[PDB]
Scaffold this motif. Structure first.
Motif, short mmCIF file in Angstrom:
data_model
loop_
_atom_site.label_atom_id
_atom_site.label_comp_id
_atom_site.label_asym_id
_atom_site.label_seq_id
_atom_site.Cartn_x
_atom_site.Cartn_y
_atom_site.Cartn_z
N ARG A 55 0.82 -1.20 0.00
CA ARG A 55 0.00 0.00 0.00
C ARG A 55 0.86 1.27 0.00
O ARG A 55 1.98 1.25 0.52
CB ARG A 55 -1.01 0.03 1.15
CG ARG A 55 -0.43 0.37 2.53
CD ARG A 55 -1.49 0.66 3.60
NE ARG A 55 -0.90 0.96 4.90
CZ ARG A 55 -0.93 2.14 5.49
NH1 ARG A 55 -1.52 3.18 4.91
NH2 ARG A 55 -0.37 2.27 6.69
N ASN A 67 -6.31 4.44 -0.84
CA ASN A 67 -6.52 3.16 -1.55
C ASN A 67 -5.70 3.17 -2.84
O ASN A 67 -6.16 3.62 -3.93
CB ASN A 67 -8.01 2.95 -1.85
CG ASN A 67 -8.33 1.55 -2.30
OD1 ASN A 67 -7.63 0.99 -3.12
ND2 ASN A 67 -9.45 0.98 -1.78
N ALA A 68 -4.49 2.71 -2.72
CA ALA A 68 -3.58 2.80 -3.85
C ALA A 68 -2.50 1.79 -3.61
O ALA A 68 -2.09 1.65 -2.47
CB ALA A 68 -2.98 4.18 -3.87
N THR A 83 -4.54 2.84 -8.35
CA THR A 83 -5.40 3.47 -7.38
C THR A 83 -6.82 3.62 -7.89
O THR A 83 -7.07 3.67 -9.08
CB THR A 83 -4.79 4.82 -6.92
OG1 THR A 83 -5.49 5.28 -5.78
CG2 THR A 83 -4.99 5.97 -7.97
N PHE A 94 -4.95 12.22 -3.07
CA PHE A 94 -4.46 11.78 -4.39
C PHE A 94 -3.30 12.60 -4.90
O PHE A 94 -2.28 12.10 -5.34
CB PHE A 94 -5.66 11.77 -5.39
CG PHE A 94 -5.30 11.38 -6.78
CD1 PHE A 94 -4.89 12.34 -7.72
CD2 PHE A 94 -5.38 10.05 -7.17
CE1 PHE A 94 -4.55 11.95 -9.05
CE2 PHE A 94 -5.06 9.65 -8.51
CZ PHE A 94 -4.65 10.60 -9.44
N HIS A 213 -5.38 5.00 -12.76
CA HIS A 213 -6.63 4.70 -12.10
C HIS A 213 -7.75 4.53 -13.09
O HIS A 213 -7.67 4.96 -14.25
CB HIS A 213 -7.05 5.78 -11.09
CG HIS A 213 -7.64 6.99 -11.72
ND1 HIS A 213 -9.00 7.13 -11.95
CD2 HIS A 213 -7.07 8.14 -12.15
CE1 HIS A 213 -9.23 8.30 -12.52
NE2 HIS A 213 -8.08 8.93 -12.66
N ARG A 256 -1.74 -6.21 -5.90
CA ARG A 256 -3.10 -5.65 -5.80
C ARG A 256 -4.14 -6.64 -6.29
O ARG A 256 -3.98 -7.29 -7.29
CB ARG A 256 -3.23 -4.33 -6.60
CG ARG A 256 -4.48 -3.57 -6.33
CD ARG A 256 -4.42 -2.16 -6.92
NE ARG A 256 -5.64 -1.38 -6.85
CZ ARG A 256 -6.02 -0.65 -5.80
NH1 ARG A 256 -5.29 -0.59 -4.67
NH2 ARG A 256 -7.16 0.02 -5.88
#
Length: 281
Positions: A55, A67-68, A83, A94, A213, A256
């Motif tokens: 993370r 959340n990435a 992300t 971000f 993303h 991920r």
């Protein structure tokens, strides 16, 4: 080689099965930080979380959670940060991450609203004249320039750390035409877009990792990083035909969860590597 395995899978009609298998073998690591009560409102989806081990930590005392995930492809010598689409309350986070990780490019594979569902907030200024400032992160963001093409748009942005008055130019690559239903008929445009990103300098080891993303940062985002990585691998190993997409995907999923979201995205991913390979040859 690979165009044949593509055909072995095709005449078999087994795309869903290979997709099923990859999903069965995917690794499973804790995401305890993502699941903490305090972070509930920092996740778009309750079932899409970054693993604890890869993370991205924001550099601040209050709460370092975003959340990435750092996808580190060691053999390929490339790293990516995947992300989720930023939420209304994670926009500062971000850009904080972008600044801290020192990324040069942000890769966007979705539209802010898709089929009546919000996929991410308007996290960047649509007009040169109405720059955005994120008070919580002490960052300012200005649209310098925008070049719109048929299937994608590239924007030049100035992100200013309102604290060092330092400023960095961020390149924003926006793929604006992913279809509402399914995947693109041809990968050509997706590959052209990838190439533009490579050409810009955004993926060089000289910069921090590109941030990619989509809505969850796993479906479309995984397709992009999968395609790119597999091409690099092909270029590097000296037996190109050695590259097994299922293997590189499984290795990606260690960093991920849920990378590649449908059987159709996996088939598109194979399509994109072959034609990308062909073109390059």
């Amino acid at each position: 080689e690979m165009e044949k395995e593509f055909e072995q899978i095709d005449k078999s009609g087994s795309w869903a099965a290979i997709y099923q298998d990859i999903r069965h073998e995917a690794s499973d690591f804790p995401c305890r930080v993502a699941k903490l009560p305090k972070n509930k409102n920092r996740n778009r989806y309750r079932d899409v979380s970054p693993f604890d081990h890869s993370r991205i930590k924001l550099h601040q005392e209050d709460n370092d959670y975003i959340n990435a995930s750092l996808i580190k492809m060691e053999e390929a010598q490339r790293s990516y940060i995947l992300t989720q689409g930023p939420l209304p309350n994670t926009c500062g986070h971000f850009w904080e991450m972008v600044w801290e990780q020192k990324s040069r490019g942000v890769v966007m594979l979705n539209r802010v609203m898709e089929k009546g569902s919000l996929k991410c907030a308007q996290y960047w200024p649509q007009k040169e004249e109405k720059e955005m400032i994120f008070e919580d992160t002490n960052l300012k963001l200005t649209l310098i320039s925008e070049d719109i093409k048929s299937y994608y748009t590239v924007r030049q942005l100035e992100l200013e750390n309102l604290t060092t008055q330092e400023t960095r130019e961020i390149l924003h690559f926006h793929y604006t035409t992913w279809p509402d239903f399914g995947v693109p008929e041809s990968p050509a445009s997706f590959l052209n877009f990838l190439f533009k990103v490579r050409e810009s300098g955004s993926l060089s080891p000289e910069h921090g990792p590109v941030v990619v993303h989509c809505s969850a940062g796993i479906g479309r985002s995984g397709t992009f990083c999968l395609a790119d990585t597999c091409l690099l691998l092909m270029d590097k190993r000296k037996d190109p035909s050695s590259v097994d997409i299922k293997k590189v995907l499984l290795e990606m999923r260690k960093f991920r969860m849920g990378l590649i979201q449908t059987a159709d995205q996996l088939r598109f991913s194979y399509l994109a590597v072959i034609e990308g390979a062909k073109f390059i040859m």
